[PDB]
């Protein structure tokens, strides 16, 4: 809470190596002002992708909500930073999270008429859907479920096939 203020300011400004320095010297990667804004928020809002990667690598909370219920992903979607969005999604940002305006990163993408962003977001949603869909197989055991889950997280782009397999097995193990 002193090195932290300089971290917020260096993230806002866009000064890379200054941040790598601040980090190496052990500054709190999850510091916030009176509006619950963390350095990841500032670096997402202001379009600095390198600094996002650094902060993320140092373990910044990727689903941090500020005073308006807004997440780094929301703030990245507000300006159309495709590059940032993608890595934010790799570190496990919740694409369906809502804020005080009832906005989803998707809804925002629809506001700005951004179709590329929209298809990134959209294709991300099907995968979480596959997860939740696998979870509601009533004729599986915890071993099968977990196996399918771990297989999913090892390779998200296989989601659909994985789901297929699950259903096949599900109706194969139908009771009595």
Numbering used by the authors: 12 to 135, 1218 to 1269
Quote the original article.
We determined the crystal structure of the unreacted 3,311 fusion protein at 2.8 angstrom resolution to understand why it reacts strongly with EY-CBS. MBP was not included in the crystallized protein solution. The crystal structure showed that the protein A and ankyrin domains were connected by a slightly bent helix. The asymmetric unit of the crystal contains 12 fusion proteins that can be divided into two groups, each group containing 6 proteins. However, the proteins belonging to different groups are in completely different crystal environments. Because of these, we conclude that formation of the fusion helix is unlikely to be a crystallization artifact. Crystal structure of the unreacted 3,311 clearly explains why the 3,311 fusion protein is strongly reactive with EY-CBS: the fusion helix is already present before EY-CBS is bound; after the covalent reaction with EY-CBS the fusion helix resembles more closely the ideal helix because the distance between the two cysteines is forced to be 16.8 angstrom.
Here we propose a novel method for connecting the pre-existing α-helices of two proteins into a single extended helix using a chemical cross linker. EY-CBS (3,3′-ethyne-1,2-diylbis-{6-[(chloroacetyl)amino]benzenesulfonic acid}) is a chemical cross linker that can react simultaneously with two cysteines in the i and i+11 positions of the α-helix19. To test whether EY-CBS detects the formation of a helix, we chose two amino acid residues separated by 11 amino acids in the proposed fusion helix and mutated them to cysteines. In conclusion, we have developed a new method that can convert two pre-existing α-helices into one long extended helix.
